[PDB]
Design a binder for this molecule. Structure first.
Ligand SMILES: N#C/C(=C\c1ccc(O)c([N+](=O)[O-])c1)C(=O)Nc1nnc(Br)s1
Length: 328
């Protein structure tokens, strides 16, 4: 069978936390007053919720209301419990309230409002300094949730809110987040295609926080190289091929061999043989201002097939890539 894997950090966080911390199914939602919030405008719709700008009329503060679509009590309470567990952590979106929506017959999560800069505008305008700064801010959030026994499992630009005016960043949409329990097999149908780690694409279920670092590397690659998304697979199979055309097939085989994973035989006539490439080949005159030796080495250390070999969030924050970023 497949060789087991454990996280190299924060392995036992949920073991030594009380059961109530990770046993989200037993969590008792403390409900607020649904009439406290008047919806102002629909901000977006996902697979699992609709998101509204709202005013909390009790404090006259803008908030954001995420009305969940119907899905099972555990997945709702999973997100709720995780948000409550992480509340107050660096750059974690703050769950302010939970109300019962009377129309959807579902929970509505109330969050702090982040005046988020247009995502298109941000990718087009972020400087080298800004990318490092915000990467560091994301790493704070990721190290925090990882240190709290939680993997986000959906790290992607759309889940990173940035109020660029205040240089404020929030990691949002914890609806896919899970508690990391050593030895637990997880759903590999997480993350958006372009940010799925190799572990997901080869159906290796015993993954951990390091999944988020792959996704984070995909974001970093897309930013410094100005290629959105960086690994642009047409489906989950082509996604792995796109990755193998950069990281090479020999290390992909090393990876699946280490974990006694077998590729889907459908890869046999689409995968091919690929050398590992040097990151410099993605540098060109339109992205070179965003590229440095530090950027490439940092990216190189995030985008490993082997989830056990990627930088942890904490190690990532040690990287010389961030030496230039002003520390508060
Ligand atoms: N989407 C969104 C927003 C917040 C949010 C918070 C937690 C959360 O879990 C989710 N989620 O799941 O999609 C979303 C938001 O605040 N969007 C805005 N767009 N313009 C302005 Br101004 S705010």
């Amino acid at each position: 069978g497949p060789v087991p894997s454990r996280a190299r950090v924060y392995t036992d966080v949920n073991t030594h936390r009380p059961r109530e911390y990770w046993d989200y199914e037993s969590h008792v939602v403390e409900w607020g007053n649904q009439d406290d919030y008047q919806l102002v405008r629909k901000l977006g719709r996902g697979k699992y919720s609709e998101v509204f700008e709202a005013i909390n009329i009790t404090n006259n503060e803008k908030v954001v209301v995420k009305i969940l679509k119907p899905v099972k009590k555990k997945k709702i309470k999973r997100e709720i419990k995780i948000l409550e567990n992480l509340r107050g952590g660096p750059n974690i979106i703050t769950l302010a309230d939970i109300v019962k929506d009377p129309v959807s017959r579902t929970p509505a999560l109330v969050f702090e409002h982040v005046n988020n800069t247009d995502f298109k505008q941000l990718y087009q305008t972020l400087t080298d300094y800004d990318i490092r700064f915000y990467m560091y801010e994301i790493l704070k959030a990721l190290d925090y949730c990882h240190s709290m026994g939680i993997m986000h499992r959906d790290v992607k630009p759309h889940n990173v809110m940035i109020d660029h005016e205040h240089r404020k960043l929030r990691l949002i949409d914890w609806g896919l987040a899970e508690f990391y329990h050593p030895g637990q097999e997880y759903n590999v149908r997480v993350a958006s295609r372009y940010f799925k780690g190799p572990e997901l694409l080869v159906d290796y279920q015993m993954y951990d926080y390091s999944l988020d670092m792959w996704s984070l590397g995909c974001m970093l690659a897309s930013m410094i190289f100005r290629k959105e998304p960086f690994f642009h697979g047409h489906d989950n199979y082509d996604q792995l091929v796109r990755i193998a055309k950069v990281l090479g097939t020999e290390d992909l085989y090393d990876y699946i061999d280490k974990y006694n994973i077998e590729l889907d035989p459908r890869f046999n006539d689409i995968l091919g043989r690929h050398s590992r490439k040097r990151w410099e080949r993605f540098v060109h005159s339109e992205n070179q201002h965003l590229v440095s030796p530090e950027a490439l080495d940092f990216l190189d250390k995030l985008l490993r097939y082997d989830h056990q070999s990627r930088l942890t969030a904490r190690e990532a924050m040690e990287h010389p890539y961030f030496y230039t970023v002003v520390k508060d």
